[PDB]
Design a protein around this ligand. Sequence first.
Ligand SMILES: *[C@@H](C)[C@H]1/C(=C/c2[nH]c(/C=C3N=C(/C=C4\NC(=O)C(CC)=C4C)C(C)=C\3CCC(=O)O)c(CCC(=O)O)c2C)NC(=O)[C@@H]1C
Ligand SMILES: *[C@@H](C)[C@H]1/C(=C/c2[nH]c(/C=C3N=C(/C=C4\NC(=O)C(CC)=C4C)C(C)=C\3CCC(=O)O)c(CCC(=O)O)c2C)NC(=O)[C@@H]1C
Ligand SMILES: *[C@H](C)[C@H]1/C(=C/c2[nH]c(/C=C3N=C(/C=C4\NC(=O)C(CC)=C4C)C(C)=C\3CCC(=O)O)c(CCC(=O)O)c2C)NC(=O)[C@@H]1C
Ligand SMILES: *[C@H](C)[C@H]1/C(=C/c2[nH]c(/C=C3N=C(/C=C4\NC(=O)C(CC)=C4C)C(C)=C\3CCC(=O)O)c(CCC(=O)O)c2C)NC(=O)[C@@H]1C
Ligand SMILES: *[C@H](C)[C@H]1/C(=C/c2[nH]c(/C=C3N=C(/C=C4\NC(=O)C(CC)=C4C)C(C)=C\3CCC(=O)O)c(CCC(=O)O)c2C)NC(=O)[C@@H]1C
Ligand SMILES: *[C@H](C)[C@H]1/C(=C/c2[nH]c(/C=C3N=C(/C=C4\NC(=O)C(CC)=C4C)C(C)=C\3CCC(=O)O)c(CCC(=O)O)c2C)NC(=O)[C@@H]1C
Ligand SMILES: *[C@H](C)[C@H]1/C(=C/c2[nH]c(/C=C3N=C(/C=C4\NC(=O)C(CC)=C4C)C(C)=C\3CCC(=O)O)c(CCC(=O)O)c2C)NC(=O)[C@@H]1C
Ligand SMILES: *[C@H](C)[C@H]1/C(=C/c2[nH]c(/C=C3N=C(/C=C4\NC(=O)C(CC)=C4C)C(C)=C\3CCC(=O)O)c(CCC(=O)O)c2C)NC(=O)[C@@H]1C
Ligand SMILES: *[C@H](C)[C@H]1/C(=C/c2[nH]c(/C=C3N=C(/C=C4\NC(=O)C(CC)=C4C)C(C)=C\3CCC(=O)O)c(CCC(=O)O)c2C)NC(=O)[C@@H]1C
Ligand SMILES: *[C@H](C)[C@H]1/C(=C/c2[nH]c(/C=C3N=C(/C=C4\NC(=O)C(CC)=C4C)C(C)=C\3CCC(=O)O)c(CCC(=O)O)c2C)NC(=O)[C@@H]1C
Ligand SMILES: *[C@H](C)[C@H]1/C(=C/c2[nH]c(/C=C3N=C(/C=C4\NC(=O)C(CC)=C4C)C(C)=C\3CCC(=O)O)c(CCC(=O)O)c2C)NC(=O)[C@@H]1C
Ligand SMILES: *[C@H](C)[C@H]1/C(=C/c2[nH]c(/C=C3N=C(/C=C4\NC(=O)C(CC)=C4C)C(C)=C\3CCC(=O)O)c(CCC(=O)O)c2C)NC(=O)[C@@H]1C
Ligand SMILES: *[C@H](C)[C@H]1/C(=C/c2[nH]c(/C=C3N=C(/C=C4\NC(=O)C(CC)=C4C)C(C)=C\3CCC(=O)O)c(CCC(=O)O)c2C)NC(=O)[C@@H]1C
Lengths: 289, 194, 162, 162, 162, 172, 172, 172
Amino acid sequence: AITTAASRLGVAPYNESRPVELRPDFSLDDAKMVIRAVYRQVLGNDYIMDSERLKGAESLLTNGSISVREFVRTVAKSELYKKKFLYNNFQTRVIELNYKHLLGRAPFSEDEVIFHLDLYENQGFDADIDSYIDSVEYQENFGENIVPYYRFNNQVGDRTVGFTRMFRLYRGYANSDRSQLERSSSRLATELGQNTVSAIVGPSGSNAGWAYRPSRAGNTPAKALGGTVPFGQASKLFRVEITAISAPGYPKVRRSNKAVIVPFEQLNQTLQQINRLGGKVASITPASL
Amino acid sequence: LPLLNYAPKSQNVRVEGYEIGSEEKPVVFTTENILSSSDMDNLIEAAYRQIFFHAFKWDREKVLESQLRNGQITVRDFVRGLLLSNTFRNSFYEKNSNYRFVEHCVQKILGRDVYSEREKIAWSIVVATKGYQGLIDDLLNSDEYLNNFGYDTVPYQRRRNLPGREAGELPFNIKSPRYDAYHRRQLGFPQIVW
Amino acid sequence: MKTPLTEAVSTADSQGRFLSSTELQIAFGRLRQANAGLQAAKALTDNAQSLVNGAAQAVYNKFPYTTQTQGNNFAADQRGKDKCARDIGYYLRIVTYCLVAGGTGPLDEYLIAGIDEINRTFDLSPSWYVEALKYIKANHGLSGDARDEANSYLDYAINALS
Amino acid sequence: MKTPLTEAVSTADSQGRFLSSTELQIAFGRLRQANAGLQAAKALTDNAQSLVNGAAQAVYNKFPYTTQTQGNNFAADQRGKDKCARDIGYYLRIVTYCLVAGGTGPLDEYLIAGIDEINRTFDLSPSWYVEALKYIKANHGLSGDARDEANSYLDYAINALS
Amino acid sequence: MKTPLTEAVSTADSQGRFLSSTELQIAFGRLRQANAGLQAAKALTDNAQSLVNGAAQAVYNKFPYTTQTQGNNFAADQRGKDKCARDIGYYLRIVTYCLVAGGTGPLDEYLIAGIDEINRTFDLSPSWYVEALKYIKANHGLSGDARDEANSYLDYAINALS
Amino acid sequence: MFDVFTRVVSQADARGEYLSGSQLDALSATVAEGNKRIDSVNRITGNASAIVSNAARALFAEQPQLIQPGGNAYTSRRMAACLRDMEIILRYVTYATFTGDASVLEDRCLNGLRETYVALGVPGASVAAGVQKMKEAALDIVNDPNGITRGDCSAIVAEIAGYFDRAAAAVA
Amino acid sequence: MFDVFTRVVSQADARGEYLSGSQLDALSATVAEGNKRIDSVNRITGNASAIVSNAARALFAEQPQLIQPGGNAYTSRRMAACLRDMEIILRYVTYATFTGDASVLEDRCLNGLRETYVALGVPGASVAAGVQKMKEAALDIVNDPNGITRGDCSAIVAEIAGYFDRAAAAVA
Amino acid sequence: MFDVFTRVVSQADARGEYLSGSQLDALSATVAEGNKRIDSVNRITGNASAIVSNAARALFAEQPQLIQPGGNAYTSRRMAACLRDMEIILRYVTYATFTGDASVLEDRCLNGLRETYVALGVPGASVAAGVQKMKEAALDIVNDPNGITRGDCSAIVAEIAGYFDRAAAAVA
Ligand SMILES: *[C@@H](C)[C@H]1/C(=C/c2[nH]c(/C=C3N=C(/C=C4\NC(=O)C(CC)=C4C)C(C)=C\3CCC(=O)O)c(CCC(=O)O)c2C)NC(=O)[C@@H]1C
Ligand SMILES: *[C@@H](C)[C@H]1/C(=C/c2[nH]c(/C=C3N=C(/C=C4\NC(=O)C(CC)=C4C)C(C)=C\3CCC(=O)O)c(CCC(=O)O)c2C)NC(=O)[C@@H]1C
Ligand SMILES: *[C@H](C)[C@H]1/C(=C/c2[nH]c(/C=C3N=C(/C=C4\NC(=O)C(CC)=C4C)C(C)=C\3CCC(=O)O)c(CCC(=O)O)c2C)NC(=O)[C@@H]1C
Ligand SMILES: *[C@H](C)[C@H]1/C(=C/c2[nH]c(/C=C3N=C(/C=C4\NC(=O)C(CC)=C4C)C(C)=C\3CCC(=O)O)c(CCC(=O)O)c2C)NC(=O)[C@@H]1C
Ligand SMILES: *[C@H](C)[C@H]1/C(=C/c2[nH]c(/C=C3N=C(/C=C4\NC(=O)C(CC)=C4C)C(C)=C\3CCC(=O)O)c(CCC(=O)O)c2C)NC(=O)[C@@H]1C
Ligand SMILES: *[C@H](C)[C@H]1/C(=C/c2[nH]c(/C=C3N=C(/C=C4\NC(=O)C(CC)=C4C)C(C)=C\3CCC(=O)O)c(CCC(=O)O)c2C)NC(=O)[C@@H]1C
Ligand SMILES: *[C@H](C)[C@H]1/C(=C/c2[nH]c(/C=C3N=C(/C=C4\NC(=O)C(CC)=C4C)C(C)=C\3CCC(=O)O)c(CCC(=O)O)c2C)NC(=O)[C@@H]1C
Ligand SMILES: *[C@H](C)[C@H]1/C(=C/c2[nH]c(/C=C3N=C(/C=C4\NC(=O)C(CC)=C4C)C(C)=C\3CCC(=O)O)c(CCC(=O)O)c2C)NC(=O)[C@@H]1C
Ligand SMILES: *[C@H](C)[C@H]1/C(=C/c2[nH]c(/C=C3N=C(/C=C4\NC(=O)C(CC)=C4C)C(C)=C\3CCC(=O)O)c(CCC(=O)O)c2C)NC(=O)[C@@H]1C
Ligand SMILES: *[C@H](C)[C@H]1/C(=C/c2[nH]c(/C=C3N=C(/C=C4\NC(=O)C(CC)=C4C)C(C)=C\3CCC(=O)O)c(CCC(=O)O)c2C)NC(=O)[C@@H]1C
Ligand SMILES: *[C@H](C)[C@H]1/C(=C/c2[nH]c(/C=C3N=C(/C=C4\NC(=O)C(CC)=C4C)C(C)=C\3CCC(=O)O)c(CCC(=O)O)c2C)NC(=O)[C@@H]1C
Ligand SMILES: *[C@H](C)[C@H]1/C(=C/c2[nH]c(/C=C3N=C(/C=C4\NC(=O)C(CC)=C4C)C(C)=C\3CCC(=O)O)c(CCC(=O)O)c2C)NC(=O)[C@@H]1C
Ligand SMILES: *[C@H](C)[C@H]1/C(=C/c2[nH]c(/C=C3N=C(/C=C4\NC(=O)C(CC)=C4C)C(C)=C\3CCC(=O)O)c(CCC(=O)O)c2C)NC(=O)[C@@H]1C
């Protein structure tokens, strides 16, 4: 599980929550809890205005005319969901969001993008939505009666890349999919295409370097090809991600975000220099063997 | 031991210059511009010129180049690699006294001349005590290096020319050839001709 | 001094390269321009007195307090009027240099570099000189390439002052 | 990739300056040249087959051993002849690029950087290609600015090989 | 962490509700209990070494094969005895935490979740720890609310193991 | 989420230690202050609407740029969202007061909040001001001596002040 | 970086082909527009200070939160940086216009700029509004019919407008 | 650095004077020579390899002590450095020719070069001899009547010869 780093990763509140199940012969308070959970999960913790509520679908859920899964399906196909997540997004962004909302995880591979992009293009948004909800994965985790929830913890069938990518899509508890630094941009287009991963940067409030994001071009690669040779005598190399660089000012400072590969023997100097740049350490990761 | 103390001396670099870009402003070769392959050539050539004055094919460091091209290292790292290279050690360290080697380092790395003999004297002991790499790292980590060139810019000789003057101070690759009288005598030059 | 010919050499030298077709094209662009620049220099020089006189009056009219307020920085006495006419003459003359050189070089090296410090230190308003430069712009009566290049130098100075 | 337009911006950007009349003259210099370069590129392109095959023969004639000696680096078999004609084609095509770009950029980017390593690794003589480039110089039938710009790129490669 | 105060908040938060009289009643329930909890923790802490050593012997008497049989999972050597005493100390220490916290939180978080995997992987019998926990129930000497709350956690752990 | 009790427990477990006598005594003293804690929570809760609405009114009076057209709190949707934010921060401050530990605030209310505001363009310094206004009102409400068993609540009031300050710092 | 000519050359070398007849004639048509392109670069450059300052004045008039105390453009250092940034963006737009290719703008200006602004807390949507105002002023200046040989600059104007559009989109 | 135009400007500024009519006319005559100046630069550049290598060959044939063991041009690096230096001097002469002023040649190549060679033990007199041989070849290439619009390049050729002479004087 996630224990020590749960709070700084924004996972602790989900560790403290149980799946929201609608039992047969449910009470009205049960129905209200499901409705609240579905709105929070499926709409990415956006505030929902009374004018935006799906009152008819809520009635049918309350009446047992539709199960939880069918209520999720209705919310996912609503003009409200599409306005929030479809009409203004690159389809790869849409697929990312669908996975997060409806399956509680991030896409694992480029194959998932191929499948859902073609399905949308050939059969339309509704058909694509059904594929998530009628999937084996949805059935195994949530079935007919449980609201979808974030699957942070390792499960059978997982891949490691899923874990790192969840923190590209989930940015903390007091946050929504439409209020994140990358805004409308696909978070995973490049990761999926290259099958690469990124160092995990936890949410703001609990991580000073929370804003670190790489640029389109001119990034430092993850691993130290060439080893310590360019640095001279050095025992081991680390990749440091740095954000919020301002102090020297333009043109001495061009990009406020920077990743550097530095040797063990210069980490003291590196931290000192970073502090004087005003920057905040986003992540440190071994870069050599 | 702490570095021997010495005083500065009046120098162009020590005062505000009110600089406006002209043909005498050193060209800024930085990787922050997302340089194309040919443009990266020029940056690499500039670094070789700044540190070696000229890199014959024998002198060149193709692997360091690839790593700089790939973003594995910064320009300052590339400059360190050149300073640690066989060419630099053989040309500027082994053929000079420690005192003149320090001068070369200050000129090439910091882009200024030394203040005095005392500055050269104070730093001459660093190679022996901290090792060759210790000297380079001290200079490259210095506030003076970082404030002027940072991590992504090729160093250059600073404030050599003043506006409206026909000539500036001597370029360091003219002022400071890789060796001087001491090694010249060992080679048995000058050669009598005619 | 920044000009097409000195920048061309500066570029090639910074690359350790002989001049090539690129720099030779720069020299052709210089040659296409030079005669118009020399004609503009001539025209401004011949009319220098009335341009300088008229420009100063444009400033005194736009900013009457300068001719009525006592103080070293103002032109309420002959001393101040002379300094002001001198200063305006400097701008005009150096602008003719830019037309001869074909670049902002002369303006950069003789006038612009450090002009903020002077204006702050001596409490001179940059807006005074902008008005003068606008006057010269509107009264040099150049046309064509001479106009376009001359105006580029006047606007360059105006931009530096604001 | 060195061209007048990119060099002008590269210089201005290094200086943190807007483009001035100096850079505008650079552009005028490019515009003076562009059509001649484009016409030169067209003429070389349309005559490319003749020039390449003529150049290859000129090399074979000046260096007979290349068509007589066995070895991966020589043109004694159709394989080696095809490689040689291919290479000469590369030189010709990239020179047309320089004419289009108005600078040695394409030659620097695509051919010159690394050519020494190739020629040494595969035991090719730079003298062979110099002969090929002389033949193209002597037979492209250009005139005026088209000839001068084309010959300067051809000579640029020759000097890079020498 | 199951404790009255955190669960009150967690439940209220999932409902998006301010705390109401229901949660305040939970706080009063916690306050009614806390002092006896803290006193029970103190008594167990002060007696910890006697309880742990006594519990281990109770285990060794009841399952004598554990002190005679060779094997990494048995206490036939000082290594295994030290592991055993350490383990019982964990149970006792984490039980004192539950008394401080007012809920099974510390036992769930630190010990119970995953214990079945550990005992299976390392071939440790849950029956051993049940006997240690029973000794501690019999010998902690608590009374009243301190005894009842303490025994609930000791029985919670026993039920988890069986 | 920790409460006051499990905060100490987590620190002890990480060290492998029993709580010491002084730590148990400190918790005993915390228990003795329990009724004042509950009262303070009840008072802030019972006045939640007035605290939120009065703070909002004061903020917009002092910062009219927020509500004029184009302002971040202009339009009913943004204004409603703004008022929800205020109510939510206040709610979590009562959670923190109830539990006696800031963790609920840190882990949930303030987790990712700055990213949210930067992404959206919400002026975080303005939120901090609103939170400060709610704090002043809330502290006065907790301190009010009418209709309650008289006693010294300065300690709980200082603790509550801290939670408000944490929230304000997180967005400013 | 690419210019209009070397962009086409790059795509041709990738395929091992001489430029086609139509490609050469397209570049000739580009050359025929060269003077209009130079004039547009010159007019924007000549009016750079006014373009920036008027745009900034309009921006802060429409978005006064920026310059209220606590606003991102409050304090001299932040206002100075803001004015500098607008000038930087305008400068690179003129570079792109001069070369007839967006590479210089995209590579040297917009790369990582969105990321820089979020990391510093600079409101990018407000940066984009500033770019828009500069765009409007810049095109009017370029389209000004006074004092210049008369002709149709519609194509150059569209290209310039496009570069401003890139800038506005990139900063947020 | 100065070029032919800015040399006159520098003198005029030092006097606080506009350029006289004769100075303007003189520069106009310089402009009318511009094509020849460009052609001369292009011709030297295009034959730079041969100029250097032919001159170096003749130099080592006339002064065989340079290349005999123990000589200053013996060993591959010293020979390579010598060839390099000749190309450097030729390169800066073309710069001077291109600009029409000797300042770049002096500031960036010649000023101080005598001391450079004395420090290294390079026979400066022999460098001058090599410079003279490049001059002879270079002037012949500039004056070649074949394949160029016929005209009189005596003035530019004399200027170029002067820059070589300046270089030959400076090294020894
Ligand atoms: C849209 C941009 C506006 C427009 C432009 C326009 N310009 C020309 C022609 C020329 N403009 C110049 C420019 C300069 N000459 C100089 O010396 C300098 C200073 C360094 C500059 C900037 C030149 C040389 C020409 C060519 C000669 C001429 O004066 O005509 C045209 C005509 C078409 C063309 O040149 O191909 C046009 C259309 N015209 C408008 O109406 C727009 C507002
Ligand atoms: C500072 C917060 C103010 C303050 C508080 C205060 N309260 C008490 C005592 C009690 N308060 C309660 C509260 C409730 N009883 C209920 O049934 C409920 C509703 C669910 C609540 C909220 C209780 C039970 C007590 C104990 C009995 C009593 O009536 O006193 C005190 C006295 C000391 C103590 O902690 O017991 C104090 C100080 N008093 C002030 O003057 C502040 C303005
Ligand atoms: C044991 C030798 C070391 C050790 C391990 C350890 N791991 C975790 C937590 C996780 N481990 C994983 C790993 C994977 N997930 C996958 O999908 C795959 C392949 C399918 C792998 C390899 C993950 C994702 C987690 C977190 C999620 C989860 O556990 O469900 C922990 C717990 C972390 C925590 O409690 O915070 C531990 C202890 N720890 C050591 O000290 C040993 C050296
Ligand atoms: C065809 C002219 C050229 C070409 C195309 C090509 N594209 C892909 C793959 C993808 N294309 C997209 C595009 C979109 N996703 C969206 O959301 C939208 C907007 C609604 C678009 C336009 C995506 C995301 C992919 C990846 C998933 C997929 O493979 O379908 C490929 C396949 C690449 C691969 O390696 O599999 C190809 C071939 N390729 C060419 O060579 C043509 C010039
Ligand atoms: C003005 C319309 C808006 C605004 C601007 C603003 N920017 C900064 C700080 C920086 N801006 C940059 C920008 C660039 N770096 C580059 O390399 C380029 C492209 C070539 C650009 C455009 C950088 C690097 C910084 C940081 C370094 C510096 O401050 O000089 C600030 C100050 C941030 C601070 O926290 O102090 C501001 C205010 N702010 C607004 O509110 C306007 C919408
Ligand atoms: C003013 C009363 C007189 C005057 C001054 C003048 N000085 C310079 C140039 C320089 N002055 C210095 C001085 C210093 N360098 C140091 O390190 C220190 C201590 C910190 C000092 C005081 C330097 C190094 C220079 C050259 C660099 C530069 O100018 O930026 C000039 C300019 C000379 C030129 O040709 O540009 C002038 C004009 N001149 C007078 O006429 C007054 C009597
Ligand atoms: C040759 C069999 C194949 C081939 C090679 C190729 N590689 C690159 C680019 C790079 N190669 C490296 C590799 C290294 N750099 C190091 O420092 C070390 C460790 C000591 C290694 C192994 C790197 C880092 C690069 C990128 C930077 C660089 O350009 O040097 C290229 C060039 C690609 C490009 O221009 O972008 C090529 C062509 N290509 C083939 O097709 C062959 C199968
Ligand atoms: C002087 C040593 C020799 C000489 C030169 C000479 N040249 C011209 C005229 C021209 N030369 C050029 C040159 C070029 N055109 C291009 O496009 C390029 C490539 C970038 C170059 C180098 C040009 C443009 C002209 C003008 C037009 C023309 O074709 O004539 C002259 C004639 C006078 C003039 O100034 O134009 C002369 C004399 N002639 C000799 O006989 C010397 C050996
Ligand atoms: C007029 C019919 C009666 C009236 C009006 C009144 N309104 C307020 C305060 C607010 N009015 C609004 C409404 C809007 N804000 C928006 O952005 C939009 C959508 C574009 C609307 C419709 C809001 C949000 C407020 C509160 C915040 C603010 O003051 O701007 C007041 C003052 C309320 C207060 O407590 O300050 C009043 C007086 N009152 C009457 O008696 C009239 C009959
Ligand atoms: C009011 C004082 C200021 C203000 C607020 C404002 N906030 C938003 C949007 C959001 N606020 C939150 C915050 C939370 N959501 C949670 O679930 C939690 C508790 C864990 C918190 C603290 C979120 C996530 C959002 C985005 C979601 C959404 O639906 O908006 C807005 C809306 C912005 C917009 O609509 O563009 C506003 C206006 N704005 C001001 O000007 C005041 C200073
Ligand atoms: C008063 C003495 C004279 C005067 C004032 C005046 N000022 C402005 C505009 C600005 N003033 C400032 C100053 C500051 N901003 C800061 O953040 C701080 C530091 C904390 C200072 C000192 C700024 C930045 C501006 C421009 C941006 C803005 O509008 O806030 C104006 C208007 C200028 C305009 O063009 O809008 C005026 C009128 N004018 C007089 O005539 C007085 C004698
Ligand atoms: C013999 C295998 C073939 C051959 C040789 C040849 N060499 C030259 C000229 C030079 N040879 C050298 C070589 C060196 N000089 C050194 O100092 C050292 C290192 C100690 C070496 C290896 C040099 C530098 C020259 C040029 C200067 C000089 O003449 O000494 C020539 C004449 C070239 C010319 O243009 O004069 C020749 C003929 N040529 C053949 O055809 C043989 C198969
Ligand atoms: C060749 C005709 C003669 C010759 C030359 C020779 N020179 C050197 C070494 C150097 N030459 C320079 C020159 C310059 N540095 C500059 O900055 C400039 C202006 C840009 C110039 C012209 C320098 C600095 C050196 C030393 C550094 C280096 O060689 O890289 C040598 C070699 C001496 C040595 O071993 O360093 C030689 C042989 N020698 C002859 O005998 C010919 C007469």
